[PDB]
Amino acid sequence: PPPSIRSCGSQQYVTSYIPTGAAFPPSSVQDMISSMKSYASATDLVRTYSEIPSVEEALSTLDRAAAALNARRYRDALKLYLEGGYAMANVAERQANPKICNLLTSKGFETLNWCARLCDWIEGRIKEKHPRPGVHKVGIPVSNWDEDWVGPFMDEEEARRMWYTPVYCPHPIDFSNLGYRLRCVETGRRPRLMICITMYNEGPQQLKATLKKLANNLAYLKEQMPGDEKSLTGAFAGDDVWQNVLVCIVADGREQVHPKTLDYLEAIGLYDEDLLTINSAGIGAQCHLFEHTLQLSVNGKCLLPIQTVFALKENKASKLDSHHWYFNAFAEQIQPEYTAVMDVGTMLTKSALYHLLFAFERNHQIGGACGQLTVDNPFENLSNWVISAQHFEYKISNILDKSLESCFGFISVLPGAFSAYRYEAIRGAPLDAYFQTLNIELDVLGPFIGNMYLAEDRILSFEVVARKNCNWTMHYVKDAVARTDVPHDLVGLISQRKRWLNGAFFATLFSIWNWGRIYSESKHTFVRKMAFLVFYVYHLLYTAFGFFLPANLYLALFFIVFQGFQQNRLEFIDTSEYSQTVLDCAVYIYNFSYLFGLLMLIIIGLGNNPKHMKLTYYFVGAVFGLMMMLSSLVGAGIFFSTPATVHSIVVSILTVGVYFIASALHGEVHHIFMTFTHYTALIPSFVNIFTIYSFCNLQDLSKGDFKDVIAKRRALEELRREEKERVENRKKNFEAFRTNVLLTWAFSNLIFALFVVYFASSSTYMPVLYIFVASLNTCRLLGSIGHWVYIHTEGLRGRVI
Amino acid sequence: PPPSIRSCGSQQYVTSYIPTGAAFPPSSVQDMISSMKSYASATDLVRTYSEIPSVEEALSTLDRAAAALNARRYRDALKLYLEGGYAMANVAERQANPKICNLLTSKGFETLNWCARLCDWIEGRIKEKHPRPGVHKVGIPVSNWDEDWVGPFMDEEEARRMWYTPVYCPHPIDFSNLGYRLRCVETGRRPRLMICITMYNEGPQQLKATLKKLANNLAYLKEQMPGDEKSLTGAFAGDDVWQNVLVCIVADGREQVHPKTLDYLEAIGLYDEDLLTINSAGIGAQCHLFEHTLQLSVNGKCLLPIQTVFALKENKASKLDSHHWYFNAFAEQIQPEYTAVMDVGTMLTKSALYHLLFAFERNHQIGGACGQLTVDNPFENLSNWVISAQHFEYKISNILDKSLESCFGFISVLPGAFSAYRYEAIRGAPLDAYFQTLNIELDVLGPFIGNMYLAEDRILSFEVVARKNCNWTMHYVKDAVARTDVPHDLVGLISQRKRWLNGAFFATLFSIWNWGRIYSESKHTFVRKMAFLVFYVYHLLYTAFGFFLPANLYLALFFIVFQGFQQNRLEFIDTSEYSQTVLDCAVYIYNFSYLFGLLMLIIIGLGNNPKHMKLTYYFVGAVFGLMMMLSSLVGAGIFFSTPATVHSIVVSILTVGVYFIASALHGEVHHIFMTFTHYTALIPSFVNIFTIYSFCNLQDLSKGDFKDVIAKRRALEELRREEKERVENRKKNFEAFRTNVLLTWAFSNLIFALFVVYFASSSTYMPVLYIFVASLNTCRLLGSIGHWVYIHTEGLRGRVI
Ligand SMILES: CC(=O)N[C@@H]1[C@@H](O)[C@H](O[C@@H]2O[C@H](CO)[C@@H](O[C@@H]3O[C@H](CO)[C@@H](O)[C@H](O)[C@H]3NC(C)=O)[C@H](O)[C@H]2NC(C)=O)[C@@H](CO)O[C@H]1O
Ligand SMILES: CC(=O)N[C@@H]1[C@@H](O)[C@H](O[C@@H]2O[C@H](CO)[C@@H](O[C@@H]3O[C@H](CO)[C@@H](O)[C@H](O)[C@H]3NC(C)=O)[C@H](O)[C@H]2NC(C)=O)[C@@H](CO)O[C@H]1O
Ligand SMILES: O=c1ccn([C@@H]2O[C@H](COP(=O)(O)OP(=O)(O)O)[C@@H](O)[C@H]2O)c(=O)[nH]1
Ligand SMILES: O=c1ccn([C@@H]2O[C@H](COP(=O)(O)OP(=O)(O)O)[C@@H](O)[C@H]2O)c(=O)[nH]1
Ligand SMILES: [Mn+2]
Ligand SMILES: [Mn+2]
């Protein structure tokens, strides 16, 4: 017996009782239903409201249909798809803009055809697996086109039409099996060189500069004459080079792309928002790819056409995911010969690609090459210290380390900007090892592999060399000069060095651990194996010395400066005078200041982000710079007051003058003279701050029934709770590992420093440090000299062998 | 002219071109539409599929309708509500269970009535603001009822029916204006005492124990005889007390409530999942409240009925939000006299509520009272050290600090478990200051107020005392013994102490800062103001001494033990012998071990969660315990070998024996004898570990068109980005503040310790420390004696004044 609940939701508050077990009489319920008439009025209103549909409602219905289809439910998907198709077909007539009307009509027809196909599939007439809407790319004219632009030759269809398609491929390896194709493959052009330009949250200026530089490089490649020994022959000839180069611009997400970048892309005819919004309504795209052959004009000069594929991912993911998409999908489809990788903003020079291709074609044994990296505008604004210090560091590191590692044909790390590979030695196992993280959950991999974040470049570099049944060796080219941009403040430098140091240390540990695979599996010449053994010994020694760097720096400064001041060993002044208070006060002040600075640095670095702590980092850097400048002045005075000796001059040469010798040999001597003073004032800051902060933030890393409803809710809740627990456990493990590593490092350094201070004197420790430093710098100088000899000789002596 | 796109979504890959500006001819489009016939087949399938609706689909449609209604869109809300109502009305007939059928029929009728009301409102016939579905509470019989249970008297309707209603109130202050009511108010009973039992992720055993203890307390209150001077008179008499007590059980979220707790609640008839799922389909409830008068039986004895309101919040929020809901909604509606707050698991004793009510009624000036807190089963399992140490700390803290602060009538912090207030001094401004965080975004409040997390109890305690135009003083009752449960391991203790120490320190700073309001605004007696001044001076001195505790502990241990060993000042052994190596080796070992331990502790505490670092914390605690035990043994030997003096014995008494004197005065002497040895072995661990880890993790804290669509998307993205930036900025500010505070604390301690070590000797520093400690302990002992005198005298001397 139903109570008086005729007005229960209408009134503000209503109380009722619902007995259980009576089940009610149906006649009373029907009488209650028939006694209410107002409902019809509401019904009429709804029937009046639903007559005219709306674009937004149709898009929402299509989105719901796509979500349901991705959820393994088809009947609701079919109903929603039919409703959306009919709604869009009705709506298309009302719109006034011809573009919008045409796009809506095409989308409606496509949706109706997909509905028919799915209905046929449900009946079992068509046998497929995981049915999806058919691929339907759309070509539209460009809004803005330059009437006055003279190029080699451009078909009207290629020149004035930009193509678009959304993709659904969840595993990019299947990008070609699902039936997707590009304009280049369809047209018959077969590019040989592919360049990937990753982009995420970047202003239009950097992209414009990169595209202009690429066009200039292509023009220079075109303009070279034939018949010369240094001229490339083959598909890279003149007047036809622009058809053999393809540029993939892989963005990282609509949510983070700078709006001005989107405006610039729309200006050059590569991104139209209306087409993206309309065509991708119900597909549920992982990415959207636009294709064009863009033409760029700067000032009064016209550049060469560039074939461009712009891929925009719906979600956000790391750069490794962008490389995954690029390499797997596009490389597997087009199958090029040389694959080049660079970041946005890397402004090349005229003669970079020519040198790279020349080296690749002539040598035939190079499994990967990298160019020299330099800072844009080093001389300009010489007042700033950080830019000059970074310029000096880039020059010295490039010359010495790259030369030495290229002599043995094993580059430790190719720069993430402007690197190149040949797509024959990285197709199989090396790429699989490159993308090991993206295919396996980090719980299975463990902490060691997981912590190798922003370091996979070294993984690929090692895998190319140690590939089984092959002998691929990396190489370094001097002339491939690429100009980047560096942070102008301390905080950005700190963050960048954090990433670089973490990746470098863990990749180096992995390489040292797995070096044996070269002898076990690879097929190299015996001389190559011996050279690799020598380089392995050198690498072990250098890593061991670099792991104990802060203690060595502290000991050197302390001993030399202060125990020459206190124990009267400075040669330009006698300190046997004074009241014995200053002599100990200097040492106490130095020790207390150093310890307090280190404590403050470690607390701040482990604690919070280094962006709001600008003043403290500036203060610590200034203190350390003053200390290092004072120590350098005292050392210079000591050296210039000593009557000099053969041992002394040999040590001084092999310790300090190796930089000047190498720079004069390679002709880059003026930069060193300009920037050595600036670099000398940041060495302790570099070592301490960067290493400590890198090791501190290592944690940072990526038609049922009621019973069915209840069971579904319980299962979903249980699964969510289990997933949350697993994520928490993984984070706990990574934090524990990073804490253990940091404790080991800090305590090893402290114990070593204390033992050396308490159980050794200056006359018994400094010779060992001098010998170690002299040995390392002598090895590096020999490597640089060997590389220069090779680069200036092998061209002429290639005729002999 | 439309291209051949008849088969575009059907095929795997289709290429087409869509010109812009032509707008297409409608005749060709219509001819293309009329040339396709297969669509009808699909249509038929949909018409066949949509005939039979489903419960889950109806619930999903209602949920979408509620979401749309909350989104200020009414037409779509009206359509979805009508569709869901019709679907549920059709579905209700098919179900077999009478309960499900009745609930579905009632929900369908309610939905249809709400649809009619909303349709009338849209036409403007009814004038309202923010229309919402009408409140409709449902009473259902309990599944399990005890046939054999003899109580005082129970109406059939009250005994055998449980009531339920979902609420929508976004601002709980409006809980009574929206028209919601409780069973107690409707029935005519007017409770006077309200008890809130917060719950979040707790096992059934704790809740069962708490309910059993509450029933025992009510029975003891009932059984007391009248006509006695110590017997309460009024609404708390016998045979009718159970009607004047209401218990609010406020959960914290369905996602985190332990399933066994839900099963237990369903067992005693307070939670039915089917009713919750069905009735709350379209309201969009912030909380769901069930009401019952539950009867509990344990073993062969039957307890007294308890009026219970169980409120379950849909989302998760802090305990402060639960108190907000409880206080505002229920206190404003019922308007009780005394409000009691306790946590789940607080097992009371028989004579707790009686003592609390007796004190409140007799004194008439107490604006809030708190009971003594103790550990359950202290003697059992005496092998464990942590439980005994916590028991000793609870006893000593309670006795001394509570007695001294109750003498001046200002308790620093009432325990979060088993506290009480009178609902006349907290109704206005004090509650507004209590809930300042929940009504104002933390950006406006700033870092200082925001960092006062888990400390609002002290805020309320201070606001009650310093209320304008009133004189309310807090009070402490000795006999209100409540037994809690304490963590058995070091890690849980560490986390709990982290929370407590953070809250305590920042609340203490706030109180010291704003103490002037008592003199400025409050209306107290002059003698009260003088007493508050004396207590303020004592509080300042104690806080100042406690801020420099680690340095004082280190100095005391170092000086006494090691500089008695090295400089031959231990009185039971002469160290003028030995080869001068041990004498300095002891000091060096002590200093190095202490510094390394502190460094490890601070790095670990700042670094990661203290749950996977169990071994390191155990090791550090063991080292510090061994050190403290050795120091205690050496000190005892020194004291017992000295020929003794009046000054020495006075210092020893006023330093150590104050604990024993106070415990013997209050009769709790056996616990101190049992647990003093265990507590002595954790003092350095307590101080260092708890303070450092508390200060390390301070960061932890809580029908449009296409152009309209594009503008909507852009606006939503911009708003989301702005919100993300604001959240990041707030987190940056809080991290910076906590880092600055930690640096200040650590560097102050280190500088003080170094200065005292280098510029002072044992004979020039220890007397000051002895004087300070003796003064503080003498003041505390005098406070305890005064409190005991008051508690044993005022009862007899109340006749005089
Ligand atoms: C730590 C050590 O032993 N030696 C230092 C070198 O590690 C360091 O070389 C730099 O290595 C990193 C590793 O990748 C390179 O980072 C890449 O940089 C490019 C261009 O700047 C960027 O596009 C990439 O994203 C980035 N890779 C990432 C983030 O994974 C960096 O280019 C190397 N620098 C050079 C000149 O090659 C050098 C650099 O100062 O210092 C040694 O001390
Ligand atoms: C740090 C200092 O100067 N003195 C210490 C006191 O702060 C501490 O007293 C404790 O204060 C906290 C503050 O609230 C109380 O925490 C509450 O505890 C109850 C029951 O355990 C719990 O229900 C509450 O949730 C919790 N409040 C929160 C989390 O905000 C604690 O009860 C107080 N302890 C006592 C016995 O009253 C004492 C305790 O050892 O130590 C002083 O050194
Ligand atoms: O989430 C991200 C962040 C960055 N990047 C790219 O990775 C590189 C980051 O380089 P970094 O900022 O270290 O140095 P930069 O060369 O940009 O100054 C750039 O090419 C970015 O576009 C990316 O693909 N995804
Ligand atoms: O998100 C939360 C976490 C805890 N609590 C309650 O707050 C108190 C936390 O007490 P704590 O864990 O510090 O000590 P306990 O007394 O529980 O051992 C308990 O009453 C919990 O039920 C809560 O309401 N919400
Ligand atoms: Mn860059
Ligand atoms: Mn508890």
Residue numbers in the entry:
A (entry chain B), B (entry chain A): 40 to 741, 762 to 860
Publication excerpt:
The core of the chitin biosynthetic machinery is an integral membrane enzyme named chitin synthase (CHS) (EC 2.4.1.16). Here we report five cryo-electron microscopy structures of a chitin synthase from the devastating soybean root rot pathogenic oomycete Phytophthora sojae (PsChs1). They represent the apo, GlcNAc-bound, nascent chitin oligomer-bound, UDP-bound (post-synthesis) and chitin synthase inhibitor nikkomycin Z-bound states of the enzyme, providing detailed views into the multiple steps of chitin biosynthesis and its competitive inhibition. The structures reveal the chitin synthesis reaction chamber that has the substrate-binding site, the catalytic centre and the entrance to the polymer-translocating channel that allows the product polymer to be discharged.
